Design a protein around this ligand. Structure first.
Ligand SMILES: CCCCCCCCCCCCCC(=O)SCCNC(=O)CCNC(=O)[C@H](O)C(C)(C)COP(=O)(O)OP(=O)(O)OC[C@H]1O[C@@H](n2cnc3c(N)ncnc32)[C@H](O)[C@@H]1OP(=O)(O)O
Ligand SMILES: Cc1nn(C)c(C)c1NS(=O)(=O)c1c(Cl)cc(-c2ccnc(N3CCN(C)CC3)c2)cc1Cl
Ligand SMILES: [Mg+2]
Length: 387
């Protein structure tokens, strides 16, 4: 059985392994290029490239609107991600960000923004190799421009722009199956406000249960249990960096963060990123938990307009049991007004998902490397979370 809906006209031309090729080697698919195309790729007539300065508030709003109206939706068209402008700044301007890697497509005549793709730099540990790579995210084509082969042009153009800076590998996640996943993860969900989630058909009411009984089943403590939990502060930057660096060594695909990157990714910003640390009776920070804020717009519901979701980010345990840490994460999310807590089955997350009453969801998230041939891994060896 060859075809399963995709004969990969674009992807078969790219330096990636074929779907169903078993990989036993480790290394690049093609050599580092010593001459790179200087000219942007040709777009269809009436469209032009534009590098978006997200420090211009109006341009940031334009990107916000493109994504708010055209980024990831569920298959029944009830929910769409609603990344805030300030979130987008957090995700797209980490240390080493470049304006040319905020790659937009605009209509020539009206200047309307109809396409986007982004690269951010990251050091990536893949098995026994550490490479400088980029992370690709926020690939989006306006709904009215769909299936016109614009996505391959966006992909080739960010590839060129990244090659110009001397980087020849990338890491990316998507919901679609492409040549070739290095790992596959599943989304899991922990109800915090089950009433609302049942009302908007995110969850279903179980066979023999009432609304009041489902509320009781998912009821959480009013405050966390772990001794010495508190918000991350500036003084915790070094130890958070140390804890994460050491904790991530056990996995096979991880970021390798500088202290400035740890500051950027974890230092709390209201309604974007939350990090809590465990400072013990000695004064030592031994664990931390983190989650980011990503609501989804709710279409076609009479009462509820926004689904408030917290996403598990990086959780490091050395002295507090992981089960207790995540229990505290759920409590903190509840306290802050989240409707649901989402997590993937990567890292050690399978050790707590069922025990803490997460339900499995519909969506697979595929992890990919560009121009790096290595064996695939189980979800539990994946130690990388992209927003
Ligand atoms: C060294 C540096 C390298 C840097 C680059 C690294 C690689 C980066 C790779 C990008 C990582 C992105 C990370 C994220 O942001 S993942 C999030 C992606 N965004 C969305 O899902 C938002 C909603 N959907 C859309 O806006 C559009 O439908 C998109 C833009 C996704 C496709 O637009 P459209 O629906 O109008 O289609 P087309 O006619 O233009 O093109 C169809 C072709 O594109 C292939 N396709 C479809 N979806 C994806 C996808 N998510 N990754 C890679 N390829 C994808 C498809 O197999 C086909 O190719 P082939 O089957 O013929 O081969
Ligand atoms: C409440 C809700 N809102 N919405 C819009 C949805 C679909 C749900 N249901 S869901 O919670 O179970 C869920 C969730 Cl969050 C996300 C995805 C998904 C799918 C494909 N790509 C991505 N990304 C791509 C790139 N980024 C680095 C990572 C994101 C995410 C699928 C599901 Cl099915
Ligand atoms: Mg298109």
């Amino acid at each position: 059985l060859y075809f399963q809906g995709r004969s990969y006209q674009f992807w078969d031309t790219q330096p990636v392994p074929k779907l169903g090729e078993v990989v036993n080697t480790h290394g690049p698919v093609e050599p580092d290029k010593d001459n790179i195309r200087q000219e942007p790729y040709t777009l269809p007539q009436g469209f032009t490239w534009d590098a978006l300065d997200l420090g211009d508030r109006g341009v940031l709003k334009e990107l916000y609107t493109l994504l708010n109206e055209n980024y990831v939706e569920d298959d029944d068209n009830m929910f769409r991600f609603d990344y805030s402008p300030e979130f987008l700044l957090w995700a797209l301007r980490p240390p080493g960000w470049l304006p040319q890697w905020h790659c937009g497509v605009r209509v020539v005549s009206s200047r309307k923004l109809v396409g986007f793709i982004s690269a951010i730099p990251a050091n990536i540990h893949i098995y026994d190799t550490e490479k400088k790579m980029v992370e690709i995210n926020f690939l989006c084509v306006h709904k009215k421009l769909r299936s016109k082969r614009v996505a391959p042009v966006l992909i080739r153009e960010i590839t060129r722009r990244v090659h110009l800076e001397g980087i020849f590998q990338a890491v990316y996640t998507a919901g679609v199956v492409l040549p070739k996943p290095v790992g596959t993860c599943r989304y899991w969900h922990r109800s915090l406000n089950p009433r609302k989630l049942i009302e908007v058909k995110f969850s279903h009411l179980s066979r023999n249960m009432t609304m009041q009984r489902t509320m009781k089943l998912y009821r959480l403590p009013e405050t966390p249990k772990t001794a010495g939990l508190r918000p991350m502060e500036t003084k915790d930057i070094p130890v958070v960096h140390q804890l994460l660096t050491r904790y991530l060594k056990q996995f096979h695909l991880t970021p390798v963060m500088s202290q400035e990157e740890v500051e950027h990714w974890f230092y709390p910003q209201e309604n974007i990123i939350d990090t809590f640390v465990v400072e013990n009776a000695n004064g030592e920070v031994t664990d931390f938990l983190s989650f980011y804020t990503l609501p989804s717009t709710i279409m076609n519901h009479p009462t509820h307009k926004s689904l408030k979701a917290a996403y598990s980010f990086y959780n490091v345990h050395t002295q507090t049991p992981l089960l207790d840490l995540m229990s505290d994460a759920l409590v903190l999310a509840k306290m802050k007004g989240f409707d649901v807590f989402n997590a993937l089955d990567l890292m050690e997350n399978k050790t707590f998902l069922e025990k803490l009453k997460f339900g499995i969801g519909d969506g697979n998230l595929q992890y990919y490397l560009y121009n790096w041939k290595c064996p695939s891994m189980g979800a539990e060896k994946v130690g990388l979370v992209l927003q």
